[PDB]
């Protein structure tokens, strides 16, 4: 696409969440959700082949249906209270329908089946955008109404998302699905702590973003979609194995990496509220994430899979990637646990 289209489309993608985040009125929050939905569509389907077209279609009908449900909440609330914002007096069922619709937009299970497939049909950089920047708008709405959310709905969604994300990711050889199920599981953690401490949902989002960004950038370095494709990194970009491994352990919540901090503080704050049972199952199923992250580490940095003859040409050539952002996000996403007290508050 020509530079005018990129400027218009990339500005609109950026504009959406900023409108949702800066808006007092609910209809303007909805408007920002529409900008993101509309402008991402051309980006997703740019390569125009049978798979990205299905991906851009499944995404549209999912996110448009969820939009209509959110709008119904915004309108039933204006009927009940004559105002364009949710109040303590807003009907209970109005809030729950907003929650289910937004979770449908985030990809939280059981409204999750679309996310792994859409992430699979699109290029890596748009998976990065979809799994990161596109989550801030629905989440910023939820953080604005956390005093009102029914915790029983939120915890069932979070428990479901942590389980389904673990089980789903355990069966995947496609990296883009492993990233989608990774996302689903982490959204479970952000959502579980939402009605209690919304600040910890922002900590878990930010740490997830700076872990998920370099991971995509790492796969975008050689355009590697499979476990066998990523297994050739020792013979292609061996300098990358040291930080891919840590980021994967960091995404797994293993100490003493930055990714342990979000799970650990969420568990700590959940049990300040006596949320013992939910917290225990959440931490016990987060163990399953580490297993299929460990399996990836086995295939890439801790063993050498067979390589092919044509990869010798690849070595004669010179790469201009990755950029200075990959190194900055790799270190901060793994070696920042000793700064934990400065991140929570």
């Amino acid at each position: 696409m020509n530079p005018i289209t990129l400027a218009i489309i990339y500005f609109t993608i950026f504009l959406g969440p900023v409108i949702t985040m800066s808006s007092t009125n609910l209809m303007l929050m909805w408007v920002g959700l529409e900008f993101s939905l509309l402008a991402i569509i051309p980006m997703l389907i740019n390569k125009k082949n049978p798979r990205s077209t299905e991906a851009a279609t499944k995404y549209f009908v999912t996110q448009a249906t969820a939009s209509m449900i959110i709008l119904l909440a915004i309108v039933l609330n204006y009927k009940q209270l004559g105002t364009w914002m949710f109040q303590q007096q807003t009907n209970g069922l109005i809030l729950n329908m907003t929650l289910m619709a937004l979770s449908m937009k985030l990809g939280l299970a059981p409204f999750h089946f679309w996310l792994p497939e859409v992430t699979q049909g699109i290029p890596l950089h748009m998976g990065l955008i979809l799994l990161t920047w596109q989550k801030i708008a629905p989440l910023s709405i939820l953080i604005q109404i956390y005093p009102l959310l029914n915790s029983t709905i939120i915890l069932m969604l979070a428990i479901t998302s942590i389980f389904m994300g673990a089980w789903g990711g355990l069966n995947q050889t496609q990296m883009r699905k492993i990233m989608a199920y990774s996302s689903i599981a982490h959204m479970g953690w952000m959502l579980a702590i939402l009605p209690y401490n919304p600040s910890l949902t922002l900590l878990n989002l930010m740490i997830y973003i700076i872990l998920t960004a370099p991971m995509f950038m790492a796969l975008m370095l050689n355009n590697s979609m499979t476990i066998n494709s990523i297994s050739l990194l020792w013979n292609k970009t061996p300098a990358m194995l040291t930080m891919i491994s840590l980021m994967l352990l960091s995404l797994g919540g293993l100490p003493p990496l930055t990714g342990f901090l979000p799970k650990w503080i969420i568990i700590t704050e959940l049990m300040k509220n006596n949320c013992l049972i939910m917290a225990t199952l959440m931490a016990m199923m987060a163990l399953l994430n580490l297993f299929f992250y460990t399996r990836l580490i086995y295939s890439t940095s801790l063993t050498m899979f067979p390589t092919n003859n044509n990869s010798k040409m690849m070595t004669h050539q010179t790469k201009t990637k990755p950029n200075l952002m990959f190194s900055t996000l790799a270190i901060m996403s793994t070696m920042t646990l000793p700064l934990a007290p400065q991140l929570i508050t």
Binding site: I41, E54, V61, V75, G82, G121
Partner: protein, 98 residues
Amino acid sequence: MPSTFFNLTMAFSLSLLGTLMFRSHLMSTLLCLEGMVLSLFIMTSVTSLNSNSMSSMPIPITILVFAACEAAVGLALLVKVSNTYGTDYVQNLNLLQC
């Protein structure tokens, strides 16, 4: 007013049922997404008129503005789905299971 919102709200539910219960054509599911926009627009219009809130009457227009864009973007996608398989049947959009 009480009886009207109940009928309008049930109208929105029927279209949400229509959207969530696919048949063959993707175009038919697009028309249900317009049944929902029409129900929401009529509710907002009646709410604003009944309460005499003139400052809220811009809002029903924006719903139509941001509903057309979806209808346009939805129809644009339906062209790409037809250019691939020659129909708009949803059962064809299933490559991504693997």
